[PDB]
Nucleic acid binder design. Structure first.
Length: 54
DNA sequence: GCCAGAAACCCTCTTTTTTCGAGGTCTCGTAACTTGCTGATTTATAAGGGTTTTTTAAATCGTCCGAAAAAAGGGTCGGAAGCTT
């Protein structure tokens, strides 16, 4: 597992998306993150993002 | 001859520094005021009832805006159905 995450969110949503992702990966751009992570970890990240999606 | 460093040249951004402009504000100079002379001619006016133009409100219309409602979409949970064992 070696992940790159990119965000295209808007307005209020992008504040939330930042709140989620920033806990799992260093921010390497205004809307991008990139780190290694375990497969189970990634699955949990996906679940958390889906839990509250505008 | 090789290698390194420093220096000269090119371009753009960032920040002060200077400059400029608008405009605001005050004060004094002065061309055109005001006050004073006469007498022939022109103009205004005391009241109030009937009569034109503009103001003013109301209504209407149109537009715009905002809010609410409805639609749309992202997703979760539980249940039922289908398939496989």
């Amino acid at each position: 597992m070696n992940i790159l995450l990119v965000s295209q969110c808007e307005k209020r949503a992008l504040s939330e998306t930042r709140r989620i992702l920033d806990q799992f990966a260093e921010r390497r751009g205004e809307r991008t993150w990139q780190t290694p992570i375990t497969q189970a970890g990634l699955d949990t990240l996906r679940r958390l993002l889906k839990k509250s999606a505008r």
